[model samples]
Target: TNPSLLLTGVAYSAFNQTSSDACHAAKMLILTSGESKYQVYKWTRGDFDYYSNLRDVTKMSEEAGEGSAYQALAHFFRANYFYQLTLDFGSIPYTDALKAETDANYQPAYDSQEVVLAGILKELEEADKMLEGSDEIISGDIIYNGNLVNWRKLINAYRLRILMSLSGKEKVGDIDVKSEFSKIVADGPLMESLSDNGQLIYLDQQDNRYPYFNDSDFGSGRFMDSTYIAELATRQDPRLFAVATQTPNAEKAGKAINDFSSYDGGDPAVPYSLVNDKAVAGNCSKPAPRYYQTPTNEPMVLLGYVEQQLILAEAVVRGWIQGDDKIYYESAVKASFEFYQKYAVSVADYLTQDAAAEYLRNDKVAYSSSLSTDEKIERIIMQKYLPTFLQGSVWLPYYEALRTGYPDFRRAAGVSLPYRWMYPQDEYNNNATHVEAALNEQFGGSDKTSDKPWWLQ
Candidate 1:
């Protein structure tokens, strides 16, 4: 089915459908999640992990089926993915459903963030309308088979998510976000139930499963539970238990928790020695050897119902939507617990009355009172970052961090988070005209990775 080409076509269509002035921006948004080729570059550079290959499969689904029903869902999926892209890397090229015939030979210009967002909103509306009156449920629906009801809920949830992302931006011609949000809330059928959570279920089968579990020898070796993560888990954060593996020598590993020096050869002063090769090797033994066969356990998360609820909660709190903030917030947290428990069996007990109260009162758990509006946004973003651990979803949060200055966590030693990806080497050589235009516009005439895009400023 060459799903990659079909999805690429959809991305191109999304861009070309817009006027010429806005075409480049639309294309940027759509192509942000390009093909496996671009993903490989990001992985090799350590901006992403090789194990995150599941994204390529998911993106390829756009061309897999033959029916209009599948095509509609495909468009919806692409729209959501690009919406997240724009949320992170403001002013992306919005080139989904509107790509040009000559796109391969042409490079797109940057579109306004608002224009790209509007395009997403329009796509969502069209998707909703397409699914509204369909009585015959989608047959052989790979993600959510024949479940039109769930699809509707997802559409609404996605809309709420978009509105939340736009809440901080300046209004476009006095567009009343509050009014739009109220309409959505009043419409009901939101992601109110955990059963309605939208996710691409990963099976245990080798061919149709998690990318982390793929039998590729190198993929398994490329990822580890980050040190920042290991420390957070020791403190009873259940999410850590689900996403990470503990070392066999619990004492040795626990000592190295939050201690970056242990990874390098500089620390023997701490309880753990950096030079003890046995201890270092033994530290990662508790969760069984990962990458040994491929990840049979962890699922590659795309969008989740919990995340959708949290977006709604934030919107309600900001008065951009009409709903009970307390209700949505509580629901959002509960959904998170449910999401964690989907994989980690012991999550429920850890969210005990005392534990819950302590987490809420802790300054680190609560939003910072001293920071600016943007800083507080980062605090919320940091919480979202935990769920994305090793998934391609990291791209979204990384983009958001750049946009809002949230999640001020330090990068790994010797690795700097890149402001922009190097335009793929192949593009520079083959599509020199458009690529050069993008380079001049984006990088002050140079395509260095260090150059910040317009939104970061």
Candidate 2:
């Protein structure tokens, strides 16, 4: 199996445990529709062990060697998986499965969230230096040819995002949020273009098409959220039509984005019974065509220029970075619009400069000199709201909403955004004591979604 392909698989294959609405369920809230396999860490550990076995994984190859570079890329993603894991589970077993045969640490104990953060940071730091140590190339890397520097950028960017995730904690025990965040942007490289985005570069075929394209397990239930669409409507965002298609009674092919009132989508919160049979009138929108139709070779962004810009903008506003936040902020907003156009199958109705500029000028979106620092901070996060959209990157918005309160996580009446994901079912069945102890310590003798992690609390 191709090592890079495995990374893409997990990145795109989300937990569509509910009505198969991976996009909305992940972004809005995670409701348990069925039992889970706790597949996240299992796959994560497998990748981690597999990559760690390659000495070249940490020590990059000297020449333009794709295999050696893939090793580094694999190792980095192993750490990235832990970054995602800690976001939900607070702590986890940091066992190196590769060492099982030679060491006594076969079944390692779960560590505290802080301990895991240290591990994640350390891995990223080494990953950055190790990637930079090489000058490799790969003609087959549909995303980036063994450009180890871009991997370094991915390393640094993801590290910054992780450091900032603890912005709420500020000082989690010995960890210093502001200082760690400042050091990275001050000296590190990050994704500067769409080409640099850390994403699964899909091919247009039976086995390799976009994840959601071939996914027909859930029908009619999958579409953009109406509330998300509604907010776009109220904001006068030009990308609204691009986000979805109009009702059959309205515009089938497309509509002037200015004409948003006619467009509608599903409510992510309510049960299917409570809403329209079809979220989009004719299943109208269908994943922006890039992910919906065959010949679907689009690079779904995991991390890239727009994200890096927004992160820098947030850092600037938070006093962690001293640059002009406005410039970075405006550029991020513009880049986000352009990013969607760059990947879509057709750019027939993508936002133009004039339209994007108009979006920037809207009072709600405009940078007002009068806004208080907190208000401005929220504004910044709010602007980031729509910019990072689609695919399995839902965690960006989910974690950001927790880190910096903005765009208002619209929880309806009964359901709350999952405080964290449910511990995988396998944990309960297999590693009984260690898993239960963690559950007790972190979630007060329960594994319910209501359990809050230290960062969120």
Candidate 3:
């Protein structure tokens, strides 16, 4: 057995757990389907752990391993983590190499999105090179196993993701993003194939079970699909039925109710309504119900190939890359269909080319292509927003909205759209100096959630 590999595996596993927890916390804030009984209190606590664990994970990675493989993985982890940080905070302290020496004496300055993204690109390049010659598939190796080919594809896909993230930034310019995107899309294997899609499949067993299973199993909470989401699905979109469970007016006899409040009164303040159980068990479909009431399912989706394909599709349409937009768009739709098929029993009609084109053209229905460049980007973001439901990927789009002001949807009632998370409380008690400096710089003199990070300026 490989000791280095084993150690690396263990460290990465812990890292994943922390990241997942943080993601879940973020999800609770943004999720439409489920409501935390103490929404604000739960959200605040969730955000704290989310930020703290993220900081902790960065520290652990640096202390744990060395070498290209380990370094590459560490970099990848940081890249993903920092992406979320930047998404939420606009600008955040860029820490990786610096985490080791960081103490009360030294506080780091927030890095520009340009600087952080550049580092992420560099790390991905390193990862691609280090794993270049490995096997096509990894087996008995947790997560993706030893699937080197798929891993390589992921590396490329991830690069594409970063490029997409930076598209509207001042640093990216109007210059052709296609050549750079093409380099990765063409030379590197992409998640073009479904089998190449990256996901961390959770077992139906033990502590490593599905995320919503525990609360859902114990009848602690039964989350119905979000009203906005239900509308999209009822109109024939496939993902809705695939990602959520709907119970009819069980109080009235177990029949599916199209109305949001049939199960519980939909929130009237928000544009879309939601259903909530009077008590967890009061709703139908017991013990971690399947998406659309089917069986086979898996949790812990870090990323999926379908999402990558959609990004590529949008890139192609924008002329940022040289590829058939139709081809990539259709591929994205197909991958989404396949994702549903794998987990649920029913399937829905796929979006036709005409319909897809119409969606692209529709401003309100999607993003109005007729609007300014910034507006178009908003549309792209809004479409992608639906897919991120329940997954921790909400931060990415949420961050994008802060930067570009897309979707233009108002925050839910009584919910304050946080500009940046409060600095971790631990920093106040432990590393006073550095934390104070970071707070001063981040808030432009004060440490508050309302303070916009650097990029917003």
Candidate 4:
């Protein structure tokens, strides 16, 4: 949406079905855990740099006050880009290159993972303070209609999320994560409702419609994981009916029938030979309506109210936040149902308070008093997997799976999952010195799928 793309020479390609090449399990093995490309790193770098440059253009007075809203947004995006990069590569060259006109350090040194995360938190603190009390709209913006209050809530919610990602670190390390995480909650607004969701609004128009629309074959060869479907279905989880369509190979063809009892998904890692005739691959389920039948322009939620509540529940279980874990637990489960109502009308029938109470009471879902604290925390996180997965944040579950070891993905003969994605080849080729230093210093000489970053212990 920003014309600065003209200068940066980096533009977002239309996000559509063909782009499903992302490690989304919706497709059969397109790339192995080790396979990666430099293209994405270079492309995302452009998006990152634009925000850095945007901040440079802000009026000095605008930045110091409410008028600096857009400038503050720049800082937020920078933080987001760095956060994602740190997750993917562990440590990276934390460049501050705003333009070719000013900055001279073309190849920046790689910072430690902890240093990068600490720096991102620092930037967010500044961004939060900058957008705190705007008297009026600062500049034309896409997501919030220039409304800065909601933006402030979004900033704080992001801080909470970033803090939560450090759960692995804080559990044993000297991070003092509780103090920093609680600081964000003690005062100020946070995203706490559907109305405050941070999402990318994709217009229902040409070249900008929903990313997966018109691509019925998006996951052409991909079938649900037997574990993912079976574990979820055993509880008659309401979302199963929403996500799975009766396999075309079923006796009752073309029906949306959800006989979850028979919905046996194929193994993604175990070497089940991909059957040639998908039409006859019976006893399985496919991704439902919006993916193949009627795709939507529905916004891709970046963060949702359900996520906020879930994070709070985890915080309570962690003893960082003072509250009843059950309160946030139930609220999160209920918010997930509410969040999904945007997709299927069937959700409307199940989102009532009574339905939530019944679902929570189920033994599989209940926070049993007899369960260990770790087990209880895992339960909260595991329950969160489906709703987060359904809402289009697929990478989230994959990341959390690494952190908590819940929902372990299984398949025959597939490579073991990597703790972190490999660094893009761009760093190796364009900035060889810095890249090699970090790779040798961290991984002993070469990048490997099994390399454990700081957060993974």
Candidate 5:
């Protein structure tokens, strides 16, 4: 009888979905492998099993009622989950997803990537409308604490992200992606500041601490990715000190903690044995200990104003929106710098806005108007990649790399980076007919990861 009680279940479901060990493992092993973090331990596609919790969030939100704030929440959660699914595996069961419980439809046909993305955008649009019309004071919302205004803002900002991801597919679908994006930018109410972020803030309590706080092997088996540190160090970005520890050799040499040259990271594409040898010799840097030591390192940004600003910056360059791209670009970078200043203890003073302003004054980091359009887009995507390290916004940098070819990810000799993951074996055993049809349509009957999907094309 109590909707608040049911909403409590939804909150727990969302928390568990985003903060569980499985989510961490999946993010470290699969989602962030080449982008910014590397897993020293062995892993495979079988480890990517962490969606049931999100399904629970969707189901409980639906039970919270129709035309209610809870249902709007359900659309946002489903959109997030389904969108990630399509990014991982090309075609997914979207339109008919979760139908086995409501209507007993056991086998739902897989929808193509185009259809899946379009559906995701539609759900977010509907969520904005639903939250706008309702006046319910919701309870048990851990992210925003039942604030409907912030929820609406997040929904719209997230819609911008989905639209930006469809950068190359403006005319492929029924939706006019450019016009839709412009409408959102012009209509009103985007994320105004960091306070409007869709983040999960952890508490320093039993069963509520950060995901990696209790992981015994976290520090030993995880190292910063080489491209990640190189990008920061090359630009003398001080945020590096906040996120990574100096190499042991550099520390012994009396290098300053804030010295960008003191840190080094392992090449993710190379063999782990090779990387471990470098670590043993004190040549490679590891992630900052605060990630595993502190109960609440920082709030995980699922979607935030920083991301929205960068998307707007990119939109201006693409002619999808009108504004000074430089202003948006610098705002996004400075916001990320200040985020670490507030949360990271190691170099709090070094990450101040004043420092960020100085960092941007560098010829390399500044928004130089002389650069080509492609160069401008690359610069913006690089900032997006920098703040994404080890965050809950998993697979985001990987997709951005695929889209823009910036921060060129290196692969092991004779090994290629796959465009997407293979379908799970369960689909083959249980939903053979529909899964097979999806494979045939998307990959010419082969489920290999090398086959590019519609989005990439």
Candidate 6:
């Protein structure tokens, strides 16, 4: 029967795999998740590829078969791609994107950040319905092996994430975000465990290996941010032992791998030369050997149980849902610890569930009723940020920090973190009319990183 449909389905899935890999690599460096020494965003040719390939999936899904499972897959990928884009660049061409090839529309108008986010949430719900109601099996799904149940869970989980990101925009007239989020929490399916993480697992084969596999700069430039490591080391969190190597100074002092003081993190905001000096003196630690040496380190988590649980915890704090925030917080931290122990090559034996429980008992780390609502949120966000040491490469750390200021990501004097990237030069060159309009609308014609989008405003 529809053999061409199957071919299109395969192409659609393959495109997502390639595009997501590119997006993850770009995001890993863009936001400085404390996994790298640099805190700056660098433009690359791959940035354009990240946009183009994800856009191509829109057409591929249409061709794969309208109203089929492939359509749901397209909706998921599109929502994901656009969601990140809106966060990275304030306004983007969402409604009319990818129409140049099909509709002869070379320049697409940029949608406001609010409209873009609303569209993304709606599309996710649409995908959830299609997948939940369909019996049609999908092919070419490299992520979930065409499992619709996992897809549905990812859809709902991601919707919750997007809704949460609009933290201050709860009263936005167009969408009832609080109500939508509460409904999802009360709905049928969600990420029940780590198995339902929406991630792209790398293969051992070439080109399919982990993004940073054998990267020459892995050891030379990458050092954990001191602020990030301090949060873990101060609480004696076991996750630190799983992803960071003990500093040479600590090793020479005969400190054990489980020793919290053994790991030394460099300031991410300061000059690389400063961090390099500490590194040269053997006072700084590099990421664990498993990251660059191992071909497949850990799956690039897009949305996972850790994030879902943390989101639930924050929702409870916001009174958007009914549940105990402490339980959700502890569960998220424990899930992250377990995830690293399972994936990292030489995860320390001390980093067990029991150890995680003990760590949570600390006066500072424990979820206490005495702390203010903001303090509880900081704890939840920090727990979410800690996993960026070895996972959450899909930009969760940066986004979480942006949404809720937590853990205080330090910056060198006079150097500030950027809120968003400037639009690509290609947009200026090819679609100047619409691009300039977006700039004028969002930034008063200035396309700087400090321009805050609607959500942040």
Candidates in order have lDDT scores of: 0.48, 0.60, 0.51, 0.60, 0.76, 0.73
TM-score of each: 0.67, 0.80, 0.71, 0.81, 0.91, 0.89
Ranking by TM-score: 5, 6, 4, 2, 3, 1
**Deviating ranges (above 4 Å) for candidate 5:** 8-51, 101-105
Question: What would the per-residue lDDT of candidate 3 be over residues 1-457, giving only the tens digit for each residue?
Answer: 4434543444344323423222222222222345442222223311323344445445544554455344455556666766666655444567432554445455555555556667667777787877787543322345555666666677778788877766654443332345667777777777757676556556655545545553432333334323444344433453444454444345357444333333321332232223333223354322225521222144434556766876876786677777655455556655555555555443233333444444344335343334565544544454555555445354565555555565343335566555566656655665566556655655555766666655455
Candidate 4 lands at a TM-score of: 0.81
Q: What TM-score would you give candidate 2 relative to the actual structure?
A: 0.80
lDDT of 4 by residue, 266-383 (tens): 5454324443233234655666666544545355666667777788888988889898788787778877666565665544565455666777787678875577888877888777
Q: Which regions of candidate 6 deviate over 4 angstroms?
A: 1-48, 102-105, 171-173, 390-393
Residues 367-444, model 6: lDDT tens digits: 977889999998888787677654543554665666687655566466555677788877777889998999999989
Residue runs of model 3 more than 4 Å from their true location after superposition:
1-70, 90-114, 134-140, 172-182, 216-222, 250-265, 268-288, 291-296, 346-382, 392-394, 403-416, 455-457
Task: Name the TM-score of candidate 3.
Answer: 0.71
User: Tens digit of lDDT per residue, candidate 5, span 1-457?
Assistant: 4556766665544443333222222222222223322322222242224356456766567567678888888888778877778887888888777667533438678899988888888888898989885678887778888888888898899889988988888653578989999998997578888878888788899767777776665656566667778788888899889878899999999999888888888766665677677888888777788888999988878887789999999999999989999999998888898789988976898999899999998766889778899889888988887777667667667667778887666655565556777787777777889989999998789887677888888
Residue 63 Cα positional deviation in candidate 6, in Å, after optimal superposition = 2.8
Error of 6 at 138 (Å): 2.0
Error of 1 at 416 (Å): 6.7
lDDT of candidate 2? 0.60
RMSD for each of the candidates: 9.2, 5.8, 6.0, 5.5, 3.6, 4.0
Clashing residue pair totals per candidate (backbone < 3 A): 30, 1, 8, 6, 0, 0
Give, for candidate 5, the lowest lDDT window spanning 10 residues: 22-31
Give candidate 1 misplaced runs (Cα > 4 Å). Answer: 1-68, 84-114, 171-182, 214-227, 230-235, 251-298, 345-363, 366-379, 392-394, 412-417, 439-457
| Residue pairs in clash, model 3 | 137-146, 137-147, 138-145, 138-146, 138-147, 178-320, 178-321, 363-368
